[PDB]
């Protein structure tokens, strides 16, 4: 996972994912706050698609890039930047106790003034591998912050 670390510094670290979407959460941290947001999104995609079929609200095939500067999600189909999350406004991240491919992170949204979880399902990897990569990002970020 050392290579994972150097990738984070060099903007080379990436993961094929399915971006589930975002949800309001009441705290900046919590291994269970995350598990919950996963269960919410997963139960929403089940509510829709009872009415709209395979179409909504479909999780989106993408690639997660993890850098010391930020996290980015790029759509595989359109190559459009789907998510540009500044690394400095991220509070917490975590894998999921009951969903082994799941990864999520909480972040502050300053306009709405609320905590927002952002869940993913890894395609080829485990949730914990992703969470590790983003911890390496967090680290490079903390190391660069001068006094």
């Amino acid at each position: 996972w050392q290579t994972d670390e150097e990738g984070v510094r060099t903007g080379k670290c990436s993961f094929p994912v399915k971006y589930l979407g975002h949800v309001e959460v009441d705290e900046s941290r919590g291994m269970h706050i995350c598990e919950d947001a996963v269960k919410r999104l997963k139960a929403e995609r089940k509510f829709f698609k009872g009415f709209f079929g395979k179409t909504g609200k479909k999780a989106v095939k993408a690639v997660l890039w993890v850098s010391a500067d930020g996290l980015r999600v790029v759509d595989e189909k359109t190559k459009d930047l789907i998510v540009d999350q500044t690394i400095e406004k991220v509070s917490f991240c975590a894998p999921d106790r009951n969903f082994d491919r799941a990864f999520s992170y909480i972040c502050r949204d300053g306009t709405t003034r609320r905590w927002i979880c952002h869940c993913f399902m890894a395609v080829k990897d485990t949730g914990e591998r992703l969470s590790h990569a983003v911890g390496c990002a967090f680290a490079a970020c903390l190391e660069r912050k001068q006094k």
Binding site: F92, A94, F138
Partner: peptide, 7 residues
């Protein structure tokens, strides 16, 4: 874990 940098 982990815990992010936010302040």
């Amino acid at each position: 874990a982990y815990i992010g940098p936010y302040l």
